[PDB]
Symmetry: C2
Subunit: 94 residues, 2 copies
């Protein structure tokens, strides 16, 4: 139905599939007899790898930011002594 098609698209968009990938998934959807699991899995797996890569990138930043946070007292203490500034002057490892 029209509602089911939108539901299909909605679910794919919720997983972050690109316009290109959703178009391909839709093509498979209405013409499955001429497509395979290798094609559908490839679409999913490529998106999966991009998501995991982005998570790892963010986690690296998360760890550095966490280290920056943890070393600072976070009070009225004069910034002339702030470890955050010292760290950023040296690098981005936190």
């Amino acid at each position: 139905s029209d509602l089911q098609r939108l539901k299909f698209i909605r679910h794919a968009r919720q997983l972050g599939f690109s316009l290109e990938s959703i178009r391909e998934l839709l093509s498979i959807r209405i013409d499955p007899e001429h497509h395979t699991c290798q094609e559908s899995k490839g679409i999913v797996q490529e998106r999966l790898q991009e998501v995991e890569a982005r998570i790892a990138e963010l986690q690296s930043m998360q760890r550095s930011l966490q280290r920056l946070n943890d070393a600072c007292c976070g009070t009225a203490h004069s910034s002339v002594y702030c470890s955050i500034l010292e760290a950023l002057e040296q690098g981005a490892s936190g």
Copy 2:
């Protein structure tokens, strides 16, 4: 060259232009700023990063499940579990 190095490091952590601007002001006039200010800027960015990680991990878990159930071979997509899952959500 140091100001540019500082900015580079801040950029590597994803700080916004606004946050970098605030950090630079603290850096140049530290005697009139506090650790509370610098830590707040760090926490705002850290929380933004953690929020995005959480959103992505949610997608990752679902995608991983879709991946694992499919044979990924010449098997006709008429039987594909990925398409079935997408229909259901």
